Amino acid sequence: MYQLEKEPIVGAETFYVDGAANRETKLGKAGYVTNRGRQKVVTLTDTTNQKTELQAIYLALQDSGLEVNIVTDSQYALGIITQWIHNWKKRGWKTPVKNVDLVNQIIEQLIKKEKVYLAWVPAHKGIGGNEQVDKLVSAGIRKV
Ligand SMILES: CC(=O)NCCc1ccc(O)c(-c2c(O)c(O)c3c(c2O)C(=O)c2c(cc(O)c(C(=O)O)c2C(=O)O)C3=O)c1
Numbered sequence: 001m002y003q004l005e006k007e008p009i010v011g012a013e014t015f016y017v018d019g020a021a022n023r024e025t026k027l028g029k030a031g032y033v034t035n036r037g038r039q040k041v042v043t044l045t046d047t048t049n050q051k052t053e054l055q056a057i058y059l060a061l062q063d064s065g066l067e068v069n070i071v072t073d074s075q076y077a078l079g080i081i082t083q084w085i086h087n088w089k090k091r092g093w094k095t096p097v098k099n100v101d102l103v104n105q106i107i108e109q110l111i112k113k114e115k116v117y118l119a120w121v122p123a124h125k126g127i128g129g130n131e132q133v134d135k136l137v138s139a140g141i142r143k144v
């Protein structure tokens, strides 16, 4: 179906995606910040922390060009997306019911692209891209 890049695409816009949700109210936020002066954040209800991370990747896919670099802190989101790509049309593959709909809409957007670089970085303190989208999605959701 597809195969992602092992290194980021030189020259392409980078999307620092992030998502945050509250367990008690199920309210959440998902968005991104880019290295070309672009940002977005959406408010979500009846969501989970894993659902907000996948939604942030979906927003970066629909708002980017044919070549996109995406930096997430989500090992689940990177894992469940990469495993879907590596195990399509294979024998021992079974789709997880956990967020089956949301991941399916991401794969449909992934195929429409020509070059996608998905990488995981740990959530860190600083002034970099992951730290800016961090404060945007956590505002009013969790204490940082
Ligand atoms: C970092 C820090 O001390 N202060 C900065 C503000 C602050 C305070 C507490 C936080 O918890 C975070 C915080 C984030 O903002 C955030 O976005 C994330 C995490 C965070 O912890 C994760 O932990 C985390 C995240 C994605 C993952 O996929 C995993 C996984 O896949 O396993 C984990 C994991 O926990 O394992 C993730 O996206 C941010």
Ligand SMILES: [Mn+2]
Pocket: 017, 018, 019, 020, 053, 073, 074, 123
């Ligand atoms: Mn995150």
Ligand SMILES: [Mn+2]
Pocket: 018, 019, 073, 123, 130, 133, 134
């Ligand atoms: Mn974060």
Ligand SMILES: [Zn+2]
Pocket: 066, 067, 114
């Ligand atoms: Zn191209």
Ligand SMILES: [Zn+2]
Pocket: 124, 126, 127, 128, 129, 130, 131
């Ligand atoms: Zn950073």
